[PDB]
Amino acid sequence: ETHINLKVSDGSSEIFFKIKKTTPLRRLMEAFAKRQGKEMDSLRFLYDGIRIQADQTPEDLDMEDNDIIEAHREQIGGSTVVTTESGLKYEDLTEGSGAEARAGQTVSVHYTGWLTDGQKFGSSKDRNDPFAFVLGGGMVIKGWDEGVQGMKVGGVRRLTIPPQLGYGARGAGGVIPPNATLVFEVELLDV
């Protein structure tokens, strides 16, 4: 056999590939990162608990048909996920500089949002149009009004938003179903 099938899983997104055994894994890794809107740089791919480098081939790693590659985010700065009283979770992927965003300020952000199955349902980067709103003003979902408070400019924060802080029993956009937990990465551009 010259080719094998591989599954890459990050716990949410799973993507299936068929790769020639002598092909470097770079293209597969890039494909998985692109599907999440992310750069390959912000991800780590493991096979049999060992990190894969882009130049390595399935042959190099003795991979077999239907083997699994696990995908993770690694932030060099570390990972601390905080649960709030409301059940919101936040994780500062990057901490910003300067003053913290406060309720009542108009902020400008970039964001991407996904379902817990990894499906991207929206991004400001799609129209390359930052999104502005009045923080704590009730014009965005509750999880955002709560979760963007405390961010600093240049910060990127990952919000995990339970449905009562999102779209609840209604869902939205022909994409988000009832009772869906939402994941956003939000970049604070200005406050």
Ligand SMILES: COc1cc(CCCOC(=O)[C@@H]2CCCCN2S(=O)(=O)Cc2ccccc2)cc(OC)c1OC
């Ligand atoms: C369910 O409650 C509300 C929902 C909205 C939705 C419009 C604003 O959108 C958002 O809150 C979020 C965060 C800010 C960026 C855009 N989104 S969004 O979730 O990505 C919008 C979306 C796009 C595609 C499919 C489904 C949903 C506005 C609201 O206020 C006018 C709401 O009431 C507080």
